Design a protein around this ligand. Structure first.
Ligand SMILES: COc1ccc(NCc2ccc(F)cc2)cc1
Lengths: 412, 412
């Protein structure tokens, strides 16, 4: 019968910091992590900025020997995973290693590695492709390498649901524990898509903000002057744990994961429907899964990408689901500060939602100077809002019309 | 308590054929789909052959214009998915569309598109990158395009667990139905990694057979002269359906899916442990999930990749799990004929396991001329073996030590 799932450990690399506390301090202070990109010449590109991880030292985690084999998205996912496991206090033993698994996802995986090996193939020939190209680039190898380093023998998999990945990874990992397939899961996502192929590919779709002359103001969810998402890098990982397992070992519990929803839009390969129908179906699944009155929802960490169509679809969905209570909850987009970490977005945002519960504060939507037509909810414009938060919802939406919602609440 | 899951529809593209019955006819005849790769200069590569899909006509499924937006691996996944849904007879309605979902995965996704967009980027710069590059290449777009085309609003996701993808996709879709999150799922995988990057990437790791002179003899699982796997393309899709739902509409039921196991080796990035301890845990987990004793197993569709270490690990795993019954079951690698479809391997081999149940026949391991040291099980060398099959397993063991096992049973 379905068991309860709690969060005992969290870990992160973001554009705001090299761990959770440093990232969260930036979130509550309204700081932007967005800056012109330094790692490549982007003069031929329409977008030349994004949310980079600043000062990442892989030798805090891995030998230089091993680090050289791995795409940055794997390095970031392992860094977040190691933080989360250490934060949990969990000791892996022969008695429990079969009951601990990992579901760390990515939207794109090792794009830097692919580009670099494609350059070798075209300029030199196939004999110059790295022997480590496949195991060092493909998406499941955060789950794989973490399992090898910590001896995790439980369910070992990876989701790839584009901008929904982190949310789906956490929800499905919670189902593994709920249904008895595991007692512990490390789950979340990681992404490093900031190479020519990534900025070029999103650029070709005209999906990205082109505010190159003022990057900290580019990401402006629900602002009438928004012009697309800001591409960002990093990782979130959480340790999910069966409740009685956590209680038995005296774990610190941050919050309980009470609900998870998925739905497909079945609308369009890339565009969300303007009315938010799929996001509404997804949230209602998640609230019913959590056994909640929708009026119990205090805080929503929106997907809030700063696209014209996405941001308005989310208002329409929240109004449809919550009716008059839509005017009582607080909803914010931390992408205003972090940008869009794509497959890691739902992972860092799940962590921000849990910290909103721990600290009783709604993070701000920075840059919300002129709310667009119909964007008239409490969007926590400019400044963090201390408030009562018993229930927090984290939403994600992605290419293929794929929707995820996580529902967290305080644990006593 | 759990609902029962049955298979009511199957679809496939393989190196043996453009549908299930053509592919299966090849399998029971011991035919190879392996040949030198055409319309591609592989002079500089150590492997010049593999399993290509021959004469695929995407315009049976899509307009030319919609096909130009999608990587081959997406085309192949959609072809198998549309076949599977047709074969099921299912009518999607407003009354059931929220209960029908998709989980079609890939190990590598859009390598051909990545390669062609790299070419444009390096030669001409980012302004020649296709606008459809990202949504036409990312792994969740089979689930996405299928949901949009058929109006599916149920769980929409994609797994990427390397060579385990197709098995995990089917197993986790089965869990969705068993635990009441959906009534119908389309599940499986697709792969098209025959470009410079795929042949070059696996080749750089010296993971591929280099038997260029005799491509049909390259894939020789458990044979003492095997020298690595053969890279193959295609797709498999199954319609999974809650039993009472299948019976109420008079569906043709092929078989029941009674068990799913997952484990992690936690051993090595690309090699299994010599004793297959992870594969043994995974099969034991799958049989426990099915409430079956190892002695009830009749037929195993092996992972059987034709790698030195992989093939011997599976023999050790089977001897460990099945003890005095290990010689009584039949175990065959259809990869002897199809080669290794990576993320689609588990999907086409689940279909072959179901068909082994329908037709009471163990498919051959072709090329098993000189069984290696300790390869003394019934490996169905050279020719198909009619036999009693009530319970069939299908195993997948991939990079990162990620394992999957499906248990299928005759339905009456
Ligand atoms: C935007 O284009 C894409 C980028 C990545 C992927 N898949 C993951 C992946 C494939 C091959 C690798 F070597 C490493 C990762 C597909 C499409």
């Amino acid at each position: 019968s379905r068991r309860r799932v709690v969060i005992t450990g969290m870990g992160m690399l973001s554009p705001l910091g090299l761990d959770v506390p440093s990232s969260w301090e930036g979130i509550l202070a309204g700081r932007s992590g967005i800056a012109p990109i330094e790692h490549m010449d982007l003069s031929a590109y329409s977008t030349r900025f994004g949310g980079s991880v600043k000062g990442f030292n892989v030798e805090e985690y891995l030998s230089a020997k091993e680090a050289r084999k791995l795409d940055l998205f794997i390095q970031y996912g392992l860094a977040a995973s190691f933080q989360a496991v250490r934060d949990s206090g969990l000791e892996v033993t022969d008695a429990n290693r079969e009951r601990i698994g990992v579901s760390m996802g990515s939207g794109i995986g090792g794009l830097t590695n692919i580009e670099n090996n494609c350059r070798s193939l075209f300029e030199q020939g196939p004999r110059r492709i790295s022997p480590f190209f496949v195991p060092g680039s493909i998406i499941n190898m955060v789950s794989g390498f973490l399992s090898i380093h910590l001896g995790l023998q439980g369910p070992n998999y990876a989701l790839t649901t584009a901008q929904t990945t982190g949310t789906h990874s956490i929800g499905m990992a919670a189902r593994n524990i709920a249904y008895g397939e595991a007692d512990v899961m490390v789950a979340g996502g990681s992404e490093m898509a900031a190479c020519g192929l990534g900025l070029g590919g999103f650029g070709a779709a005209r999906a990205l903000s082109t505010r190159n002359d003022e990057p900290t103001r580019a990401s402006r969810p629900w602002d009438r002057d928004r012009d697309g998402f800001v591409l960002s890098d990093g990782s979130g990982a959480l340790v999910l744990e069966e409740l009685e397992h956590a209680r038995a070992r005296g774990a610190r519990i941050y919050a309980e994961l009470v609900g998870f929803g998925m739905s497909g839009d079945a609308f369009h390969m890339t565009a969300p429907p303007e009315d938010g129908a799929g996001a509404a179906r997804c949230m209602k699944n998640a609230l019913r899964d959590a056994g909640l009155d929708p009026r119990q929802v205090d805080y929503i960490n929106a997907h809030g990408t700063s696209t014209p169509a996405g941001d308005i679809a989310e208002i329409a969905a929240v109004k449809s689901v919550f009716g008059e209570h839509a005017h009582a909850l607080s909803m914010s987009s931390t992408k205003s500060m972090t940008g869009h970490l794509l497959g890691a977005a739902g992972a860092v945002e799940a962590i921000f939602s849990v910290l909103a519960l721990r600290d009783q504060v709604a993070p701000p939507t920075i840059n919300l100077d002129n709310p667009d037509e119909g964007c008239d909810l409490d969007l926590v414009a400019h400044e963090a809002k201390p408030r009562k938060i018993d229930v927090a919802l984290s939403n994600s939406f992605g290419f293929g019309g794929t929707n995820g919602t996580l529902v967290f609440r305080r644990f006593a």
